[PDB]
C-alpha cells in the first residue's frame, strides 16, 4: 500500500556499495603497489653508488650497504626488498593487501650509461650480465593493471 521509498533507497545504497566495491578494490591495490615502489626506490642510491664506485653491481643488500636482511626493508604491504646483483625487488606482504597482488613483486634495475646509470621500474627481472637482465618469469609478478604508468618498463628497456 505504501512503504517503498525506504526499501528502494536501502537497496540502492546496497548496490551502490557493490559498484563502488571494485573501484576501491583496484584503487586500493594500485595504492599498495605504489608503496612497494617507494620502498624499492631510495635504495637506488646505495646501488648506484656501489656500481659507479666499483663498476660491479652490488650482489646483495649488505654489499649495497643496506639492512643486511631483506626482511628488514619491509612495510605495511611490503614483506621485503632484496637487492640481487643491482636489481632491487619488492615483495608484497600477505596481510593487509588487495587479494590478487599479495606475495607478488616488482623490480627496479639499472643500466650503465657510462659515467652514470639510468633506472627502470617494472615487473620482476633477473640480472644476466652487468648490462642485461631478463623477466623473472615465474607467476608472482604484480599484474600490469596494478602498476603505475611510470613502472611499465620491459626487461629490454633502454
Amino acid at each position: 500500500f505504501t512503504l517503498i521509498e525506504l526499501m528502494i533507497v536501502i537497496a540502492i545504497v546496497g548496490i551502490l556499495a557493490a559498484v563502488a566495491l571494485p573501484a576501491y578494490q583496484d584503487y586500493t591495490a594500485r595504492a599498495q603497489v605504489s608503496e612497494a615502489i617507494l620502498l624499492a626506490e631510495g635504495q637506488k642510491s646505495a646501488v648506484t653508488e656501489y656500481y659507479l664506485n666499483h663498476g660491479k653491481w652490488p650482489e646483495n643488500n649488505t654489499s649495497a650497504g643496506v639492512a643486511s636482511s631483506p626482511t628488514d626493508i619491509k612495510g605495511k604491504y611490503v614483506k621485503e626488498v632484496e637487492v640481487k646483483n643491482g636489481v632491487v625487488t619488492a615483495t608484497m606482504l600477505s596481510s593487509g593487501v588487495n587479494n590478487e597482488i599479495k606475495g607478488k613483486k616488482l623490480s627496479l634495475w639499472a643500466r650503465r650509461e657510462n659515467g652514470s646509470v639510468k633506472w627502470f621500474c617494472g615487473q620482476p627481472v633477473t640480472r644476466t650480465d652487468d648490462d642485461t637482465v631478463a623477466d623473472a618469469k615465474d607467476g608472482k609478478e604484480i599484474d600490469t593493471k596494478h602498476l603505475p604508468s611510470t613502472c611499465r618498463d620491459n626487461f629490454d628497456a633502454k
Binding site: I15, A18, V19, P22, A23
Partner: protein, 59 residues
Amino acid sequence: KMFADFGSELPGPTQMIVNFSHMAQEYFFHVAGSIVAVVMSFTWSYRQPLFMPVFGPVL
C-alpha cells in the same frame, strides 16, 4: 534502459570496449527482464480486459 544508460560499470554491465556482440549477449539478462516485464503488463491488459451440475457456470 535509462538507469542502465547512466554511464558505464554499473551492476552486471560491461565495459564499452568489448566487442558489441559479446556486450549485447551478456546483457541478455536485462533484455530478458524487460521482455518479461512487457509480457506481464500485456497479460494484465489482455486478461483483465464428481458432481457435474456443481461445475456448470450459473447466473
